[PDB]
Amino acid sequence: FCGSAMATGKFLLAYSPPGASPPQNRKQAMLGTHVIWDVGLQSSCVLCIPWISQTHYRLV
Amino acid sequence: GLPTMLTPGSNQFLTSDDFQSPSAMPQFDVTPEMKIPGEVHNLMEIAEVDSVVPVNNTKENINSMEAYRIPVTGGDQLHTQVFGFQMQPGLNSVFKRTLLGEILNYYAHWSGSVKLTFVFCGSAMATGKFLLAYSPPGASPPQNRKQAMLGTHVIWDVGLQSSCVLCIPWISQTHYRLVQQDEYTSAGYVTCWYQTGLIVPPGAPPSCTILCFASACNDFSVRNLRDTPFIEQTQLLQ
Amino acid sequence: GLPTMLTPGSNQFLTSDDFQSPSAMPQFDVTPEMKIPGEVHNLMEIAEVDSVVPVNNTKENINSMEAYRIPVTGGDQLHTQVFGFQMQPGLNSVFKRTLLGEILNYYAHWSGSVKLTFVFCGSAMATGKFLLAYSPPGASPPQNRKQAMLGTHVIWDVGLQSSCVLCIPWISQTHYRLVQQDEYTSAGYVTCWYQTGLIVPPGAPPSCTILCFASACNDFSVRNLRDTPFIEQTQLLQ
Amino acid sequence: NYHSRTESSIENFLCRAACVYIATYKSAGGTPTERYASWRINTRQMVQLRRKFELFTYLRFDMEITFVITSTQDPGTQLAQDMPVLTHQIMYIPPGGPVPNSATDFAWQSSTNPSIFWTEGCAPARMSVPFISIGNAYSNFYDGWSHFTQEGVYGFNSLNNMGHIYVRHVNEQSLGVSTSTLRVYFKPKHVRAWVPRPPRLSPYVKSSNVNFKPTAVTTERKDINDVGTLRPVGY
Amino acid sequence: GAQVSTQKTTIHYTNINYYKDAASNSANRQDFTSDRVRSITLGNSTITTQECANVVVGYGVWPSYLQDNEATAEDQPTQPDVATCRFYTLDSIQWQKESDGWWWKFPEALKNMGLFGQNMEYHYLGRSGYTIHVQCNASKFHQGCLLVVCVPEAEMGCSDVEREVVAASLSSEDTAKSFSRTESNGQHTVQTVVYNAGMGVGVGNLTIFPHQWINLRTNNSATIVMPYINSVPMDNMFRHYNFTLMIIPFAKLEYTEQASNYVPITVTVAPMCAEYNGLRLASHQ
Numbered sequence A: 001f002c003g004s005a006m007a008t009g010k011f012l013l014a015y016s017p018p019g020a021s022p023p024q025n026r027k028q029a030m031l032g033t034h035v036i037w038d039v040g041l042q043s044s045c046v047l048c049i050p051w052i053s054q055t056h057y058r059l060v
Numbered sequence B, C: 001g002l003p004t005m006l007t008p009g010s011n012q013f014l015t016s017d018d019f020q021s022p023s024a025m026p027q028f029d030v031t032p033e034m035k036i037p038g039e040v041h042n043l044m045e046i047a048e049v050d051s052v053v054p055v056n057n058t059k060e061n062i063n064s065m066e067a068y069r070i071p072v073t074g075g076d077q078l079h080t081q082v083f084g085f086q087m088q089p090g091l092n093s094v095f096k097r098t099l100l101g102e103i104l105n106y107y108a109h110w111s112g113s114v115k116l117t118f119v120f121c122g123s124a125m126a127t128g129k130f131l132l133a134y135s136p137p138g139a140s141p142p143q144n145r146k147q148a149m150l151g152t153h154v155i156w157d158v159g160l161q162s163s164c165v166l167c168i169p170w171i172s173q174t175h176y177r178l179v180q181q182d183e184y185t186s187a188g189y190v191t192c193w194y195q196t197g198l199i200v201p202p203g204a205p206p207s208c209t210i211l212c213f214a215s216a217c218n219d220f221s222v223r224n225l226r227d228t229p230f231i232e233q234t235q236l237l238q
Numbered sequence D: 001n002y003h004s005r006t007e008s009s010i011e012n013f014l015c016r017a018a019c020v021y022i023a024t025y026k027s028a029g030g031t032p033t034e035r036y037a038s039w040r041i042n043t044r045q046m047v048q049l050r051r052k053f054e055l056f057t058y059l060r061f062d063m064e065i066t067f068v069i070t071s072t073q074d075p076g077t078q079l080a081q082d083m084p085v086l087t088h089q090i091m092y093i094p095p096g097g098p099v100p101n102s103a104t105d106f107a108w109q110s111s112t113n114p115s116i117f118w119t120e121g122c123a124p125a126r127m128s129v130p131f132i133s134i135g136n137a138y139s140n141f142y143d144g145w146s147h148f149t150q151e152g153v154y155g156f157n158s159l160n161n162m163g164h165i166y167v168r169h170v171n172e173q174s175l176g177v178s179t180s181t182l183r184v185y186f187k188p189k190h191v192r193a194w195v196p197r198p199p200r201l202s203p204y205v206k207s208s209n210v211n212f213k214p215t216a217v218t219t220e221r222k223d224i225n226d227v228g229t230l231r232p233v234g235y
Numbered sequence E: 001g002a003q004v005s006t007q008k009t010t011i012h013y014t015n016i017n018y019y020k021d022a023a024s025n026s027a028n029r030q031d032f033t034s035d036r037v038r039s040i041t042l043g044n045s046t047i048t049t050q051e052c053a054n055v056v057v058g059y060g061v062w063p064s065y066l067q068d069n070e071a072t073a074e075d076q077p078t079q080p081d082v083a084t085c086r087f088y089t090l091d092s093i094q095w096q097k098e099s100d101g102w103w104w105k106f107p108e109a110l111k112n113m114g115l116f117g118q119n120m121e122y123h124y125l126g127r128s129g130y131t132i133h134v135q136c137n138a139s140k141f142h143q144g145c146l147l148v149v150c151v152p153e154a155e156m157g158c159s160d161v162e163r164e165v166v167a168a169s170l171s172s173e174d175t176a177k178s179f180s181r182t183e184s185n186g187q188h189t190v191q192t193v194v195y196n197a198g199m200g201v202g203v204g205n206l207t208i209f210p211h212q213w214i215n216l217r218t219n220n221s222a223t224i225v226m227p228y229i230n231s232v233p234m235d236n237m238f239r240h241y242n243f244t245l246m247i248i249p250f251a252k253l254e255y256t257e258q259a260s261n262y263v264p265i266t267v268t269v270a271p272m273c274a275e276y277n278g279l280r281l282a283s284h285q
């Protein structure tokens, strides 16, 4: 987060697996794996998107 | 058979007794024991949990939520008294519906040390010092800071730490003071005065709100049991 | 002599007591003991013996003997429900005059697993499969076989074996459910559906009769005792 | 620091017998509902015990029930002139039992029910009952409906299934008419209390739910820094 | 038999039990004496709270399973450890100056999110501990305070006396019901005044129930790890609310002219060790 020191906020970043349709509202995103990041407490929150796949290798 | 003699106290119904009695459901097994969390053992463990005290208990304010928020305006005052109350945990309007008071109101006598923790709800940049002084019963309430300084006091830096706590000491002629305190077995006044004056920067709002939490210290005791003069009824409610 | 005090509970006549009393026939010898067979020890041993349940308890049928015989007509149905009843062993019309119910009706609370054994009285050559499913209280009674399949069920081959038995399981929020079951502490519906359709050869009659036997499994218990609301009187009968 | 708590325990706060019900029943012919007096077993009728229970969410105790049955003489004519002692019968009815419609009924035999016969001029009758419920705790608050489709009653009035105490006279009283009053007292012992919760600020208005009117927090004092009185009330 | 003990002032007392029932003895009445932040990874969705922040662990106990020592069920089908443990995020309530308060009812507030509303819609029983984490993005010029509290069995009184309450007014589906600073005039709604907290108790006395403060000066978020509290070990989640969140601002938020005025509040609960029993082919709605 490149922002003023005094700024504070929380963002939910969610990796939704292929399943059905893209998340369109926060309630849809909450079910999928997610991290709540407090911008004020820490900048640079990191999400390690997990490897969940039918095959060992996915074509580029 | 055995030639007993019936002493006085026979065929009576003293309420606070401990007698045996035959069972109406004989050989009745019970449901087995489960571990519900929060198994309290003594009632005074409810009087060790802080409950906000309505310090601004003015007539218009009591009905509203704004009876728990004590004003700490920023400016040059240096004489204004933020708050003052007789430290009577049982009768005083400030502490009577607080959790410490409600358990205490059930019990006639109170002995221990009360702890008031005053949190500061204000902008991070705000900085100020307040002197909170417990003046013992002595003579007259503190009316200027110089009068308050003599009595036991703590200087709290709002900026360095929020939540300064004052453990009001137990100084009393008798081991126990009645919850309905009289001039005898009464308790001293508690008051708070500005030390430096709140300094709030241009970007933050000048006014701030301070709240008061009251819970008994570990050494608190009750001595008797009585009806609570807070709840009543008229008929058998149906 | 001994200065006793008469506690509350003196000069009373509690019925479910256990007190000593002086004898009216002193030094009266008895007839010696004989070993009559069938010495029952506990009352629940009567509730472990099967008693036919009147499953076809329709208004015209109850007066007649034809209330114990459940119809299993042969043909292509595949939707018809042979029987369905809420598994309330105490209030339900089906189980209340059965032996399990009569002992149970004496006791207020019931906890255990009921067993229904459905015998097939039919020609040796007949063959068919029936799905008997205990649907737990959940939502609504099973109305088609696909709804019944989800709930616990047993497929019975009438030809391979007569007398298939379903031990309805004890799944309940509380350890004990009141015999007068309410919506709370109630029990799930039990239903039976055709799987293949009875196949009866030309030489045998197409219709057949299935009967239901109900007895508690070993783990059954009662908790309280009360008047049976089945028998009454008006005056001292002479 | 040698001022430890003994009378603040969960026993001594709750091992005191509080009055729970006030009945009234006559002993004359006509109006047969005036002969007996029924009571479904709540603790929510009288307030003085109700506030002590509604500090904790769940409870589990054994109880000691007692009755101070006193009687008067009804005014009018055809009075007794002389009167032997009159005995009372207190019958517990379990949940799901047959209740008597009136006095001198067929169902007053009480073969299974724990009836108790009490004579006047004696000590008050006493019995002990154990922890009797289907659940594991007497829940004082049940935030939930009865039916799974969210209808029916709401509140604590779904797990209070404790049956009724039906009291009657067992004398015919050929000449006179005389009422009697029943006062039930509950003294719970071996008490365990789980999940404490605040006292009820508002007054009680019902015995079915937690209805209330919005009351003030505390009483009003003069100012923010009012210390009460500086001298006595004189001058 | 023939016991001797002490009394509260040698002096003793010899009391015997003359009865064959455990509930017929007397009462006992005697005692025998750039920066580092922690990241909770539960399921497949993390959070970032603070290094310095305390986490309130319920009523002392951590949420755990229901062992075989205290089970009364007949058969016990499987409980998932990944499928229903994610940090589900609910709708974002908006904090203004004169905002009264908000509440939730969590066994009937997760019925649409994930599989937690797809397991309890089928099974009869249910049991789950919760790991509520409520956050609001802070700044140094945005003074104000907050109180969260998970009150268990929060029976709420109706607005009009001699009425019951309706399920549409007690809980909501995705929204948090407001807490009128005044008194509701409804005929079937809830008595939603803010200085009595719905239940009729004093709103200052909500600090017994596990509580945490989201004071904007010294705290950004708050995390309460509530345990499953119920008398019966298993009860259905559609006709019973296990507890109730209550977010009541004790001090109103006061910004300045050149400052942001759309400060949000989100709640990010996550069921821990959710168990189910009694599979019935129902599909409730």
Ligand SMILES: CCCCCCCCCCCCC/C=C/[C@H](O)[C@H](N)CO
Binding pocket: B024, D041, D042, D043, D044, D063, D065, D090, D091, D092, D114, D116, D127, D129, D138, D139, D140, D156, D159, D160, D162, D165
């Ligand atoms: C001696 C004859 C009368 C016997 C009466 C039977 C025992 C009395 C019932 C016990 C009452 C249990 C304590 C309270 C139960 C419920 O949880 C509360 N009413 C909650 O509303």
